[PDB]
Design a binder for this molecule. Structure first.
Ligand code: HEM
Ligand SMILES: O=C(O)c1ccc(CO)cc1
Ligand SMILES: [Cl-]
Ligand SMILES: [Mg+2]
Ligand SMILES: [Mg+2]
Length: 393
């Protein structure tokens, strides 16, 4: 009843161009079995959304990578938020919600916007830049470590550690083995910065530790929640901003609409998150036998959710393969959905908005003008190098 496919969604050829295989995965049926890795897969919007919103059957506490924590040791101590189910999830989630709250965004908006404006003006003095190293990476590196309250020393471990985290959700392929092998120096840096004396007062890390007084988290939970922000909150925004710039470079008509109304910046970023889905995939593990798409999935089975595919499913989206900055984007699953829906989404959108606002006001054209190179990661989709010429407004 369930179709068996040989597609390896963690292969380099799949990462290089996933869209034909994602359609095969959708059109084969609402649920497929991937023989390469012995997992179920769901790639249509409706089933992806339903699984994300059914946490009592499709759980996260057995790992949201391929590895099942009931069968294997996690490569690092489990996350108290990503790799937890309610009720254990709830109070750590509330702490991160409060630390990254609407109210908190007021405290960082002026500096985040000023740094985006300054970066775009700086790049306009050069003309021809690499939108990854010089923009998608440079801008988050200039604001987010500081907003965390990190010291200066050791920051060169932040992107390597995040790449490791995201590669480690994948299957035990070469990308995962290479990431985990000799990763101890990256882990040691991050783990040390999670300790309270290393985090500047007022920054996100120190604010997490300040919640240990309230009873929401104990002091020994706070370093792992700082660890969550250092895992999830940098590389994602690099690939999100890079996706938006790549979208604007390829769709000049949409750059021109953005220039004409910079208040479209927030939805232009949201649409880039849908269109490229920088976080491509996550797993769940079934806690019980469960019918999904007419297939009976046993207990203890891994289920791979294709977020990027759900975000391009023609059953749900009109012209899914077009970048449309006035699209009604609500419902896309690029930040997830349900109890684990990205708790950093306001920070991600703040960064993306203010960068796209600066481009909208200051740039007239974005032209690719050198070799484009893709970056490969078991979970993240994005580019290694994106040479563009920026023309001033
Ligand atoms: C464009 C940028 C981002 C994207 C595309 C993204 C994507 C996602 C997704 C898909 C999930 C759901 C995981 C799941 O259901 O298993 C999630 C969760 C999470 N994200 Fe983000 N994220 C981004 C930015 C950020 C930022 C800036 C932060 C922190 C500053 C952050 C911190 C987290 C955390 C801690 C979780 C776990 C929430 C929970 O399990 O309740 N993310 N993210
Ligand atoms: O809690 C974490 O360490 C963590 C890591 C990765 C994600 C990816 O969205 C979310 C949370
Ligand atoms: Cl670690
Ligand atoms: Mg260890
Ligand atoms: Mg010290």
């Amino acid at each position: 009843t369930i179709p068996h496919l040989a597609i390896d969604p963690f292969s380099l050829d799949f990462f290089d161009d996933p869209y034909p295989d994602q359609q095969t995965l959708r059109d084969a049926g609402p649920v497929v079995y991937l023989d390469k890795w012995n997992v179920y897969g769901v790639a249509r919007y409706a089933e992806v959304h339903a699984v994300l919103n059914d946490p009592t059957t499709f759980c996260s506490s057995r790992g949201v990578g391929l590895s099942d924590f009931k069968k294997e040791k996690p490569w690092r101590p489990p996350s108290l938020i990503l790799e937890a189910d309610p009720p254990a999830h709830t109070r750590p989630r509330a702490v991160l919600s409060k630390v990254l709250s609407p109210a908190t965004m007021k405290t960082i908006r002026d500096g985040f916007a000023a740094a985006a404006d300054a970066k775009v003006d700086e790049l306009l003095q050069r003309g021809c830049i690499d939108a990854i190293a010089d923009l998608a990476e440079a801008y988050p590196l200039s604001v987010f470590p500081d907003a965390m309250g990190l010291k200066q020393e050791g920051r060169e471990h932040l992107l390597p550690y995040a790449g490791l985290v995201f590669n480690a959700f994948g299957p035990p392929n070469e990308l995962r083995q290479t990431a985990i092998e000799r990763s101890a120096p990256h882990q040691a840096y991050v783990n040390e910065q999670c300790q309270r004396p290393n985090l500047a007062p007022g920054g996100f890390g120190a604010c997490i530790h300040a919640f240990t007084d309230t009873g929401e988290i104990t002091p020994d939970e706070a370093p792992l929640l700082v660890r969550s922000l250092l895992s999830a909150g940098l590389d994602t925004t690099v690939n999100g901003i890079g996706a938006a710039v790549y979208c604007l470079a390829r769709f000049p008509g949409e750059l021109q609409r953005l220039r004409s109304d910079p208040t479209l910046a927030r939805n232009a970023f949201e649409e880039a998150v849908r269109f490229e889905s920088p976080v491509q995939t996550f797993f769940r593990t079934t806690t019980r036998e469960v019918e999904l798409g007419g297939a009976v999935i046993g207990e203890g089975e891994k289920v791979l959710m294709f977020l990027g595919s759900a975000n391009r499913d023609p059953r749900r989206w009109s012209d899914p393969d077009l970048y449309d900055i006035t699209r009604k984007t609500s419902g896309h699953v690029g930040f997830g959905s349900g109890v684990h829906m990205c708790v950093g989404q306001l920070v991600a959108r703040l960064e993306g908005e203010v960068m796209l606002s600066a481009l909208a006001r200051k740039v007239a054209a974005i032209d690719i003008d050198g070799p484009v190179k893709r970056r490969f990661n078991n979970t993240l989709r994005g580019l290694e190098s994106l040479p563009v010429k920026l023309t001033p407004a």
